[PDB]
Amino acid sequence: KKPKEPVQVPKLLIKGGVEVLEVKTGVDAITEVECFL
Amino acid sequence: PKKPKEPVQVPKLLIKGGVEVLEVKTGVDAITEVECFLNPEMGDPDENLRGFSLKLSAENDFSSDSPERKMLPCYSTARIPLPNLNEDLTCGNLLMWEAVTVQTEVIGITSMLNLHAGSQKVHEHGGGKPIQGSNFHFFAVGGEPLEMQGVLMNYRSKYPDGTITPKNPTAQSQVMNTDHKAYLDKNNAYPVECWVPDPSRNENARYFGTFTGGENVPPVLHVTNTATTVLLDEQGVGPLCKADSLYVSAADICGLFTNSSGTQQWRGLARYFKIRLRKRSVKNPYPISFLLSDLINRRTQRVDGQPMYGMESQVEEVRVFDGTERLPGDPDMIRYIDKQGQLQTKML
Render the burial of B301-314: b for 16+ CB within 10 Å, e for the rest: eeeeeeeeeeeeee
Q: Which of B91, B94, B202 to mutate to test the interface with A (most CBs of A within 10 A)?
A: B94
Q: Distance between CA B266 and CA B53 in Å, rounded?
A: 5
Phi first, then psi: give them for residue B112, nearest 5 degrees.
-65, 0
- Nearest CB to B281: which of A2, A13, A15? A2
What would you measure as the largest C-alpha separation in chain B, in angstroms? 113
Structural method: cryo-EM
Q: Distance between CA B51 and CA B131 in Å, rounded?
A: 14
3-state helix, strand, coil in chain B (%, to 5): 5, 30, 65
Q: Distance between CA B168 and CA B158 in Å, rounded?
A: 11
What is the distance between the terminal CA atoms of chain B, rounded to a whole angstrom?
104
Judged by a CB distance cut-off of 8 A, whether residue A36 touches chain B is yes
CA angle B111, B117, B118 (to 5 degrees): 90
Q: Distance between CA B319 and CA B323 in Å, rounded?
A: 9
Judged by a CB distance cut-off of 8 A, whether residue A29 touches chain B is no
Q: Distance between CA B15 and CA B80 in Å, rounded?
A: 19
CA B50 to chain centre: 25
- Whether residue B315 contacts residue B308, with contact meaning beta carbons closer than 8 Å, is answered with yes
B18, with CB counted inside 10 A (0-12, 13-18, 19+), is exposed
Residue B79 falls in which region: left (phi positive, over 0), alpha (psi -120 to 50) or beta: beta
Q: Distance between CA B314 and CA B341 in Å, rounded?
A: 29
What would you measure as the largest C-alpha separation in chain A, in angstroms? 47
- Across the interface, whether the CB atoms of B282 and A6 are under 8 A apart is answered yes
Smallest CA–CA distance, residue A28 to chain B, in Å, is 16
Q: Distance between CA B331 and CA B327 in Å, rounded?
A: 8
B134, with CB counted inside 10 A (0-12, 13-18, 19+), is middle
Phi first, then psi: give them for residue B294, nearest 5 degrees.
-150, 140
**Which chain A residue is nearest to residue B28, measuring alpha carbons?**
A2
Judged by a CB distance cut-off of 8 A, whether residue B92 touches chain A is yes
Phi first, then psi: give them for residue A36, nearest 5 degrees.
-170, 165
CB within 8 A of A31, min separation 6: which ones? A12, A14, A15, A16, A20
B84, with CB counted inside 10 A (0-12, 13-18, 19+), is middle
Q: Distance between CA B275 and CA B256 in Å, rounded?
A: 29
Of B102, B122, B75, B90, the closest CA to residue B264 belongs to B122
- Across the interface, whether the CB atoms of B91 and A3 are under 8 A apart is answered yes
Smallest CA–CA distance, residue B57 to chain A, in Å, is 32
Render the burial of B25-58: b for 16+ CB within 10 Å, e for the rest: eeebebbbbbeeebbbbbbbbeeebebbbbbeee
For residue B334, what are the β-bridge partners?
B345
Smallest CA–CA distance, residue A34 to chain B, in Å, is 7
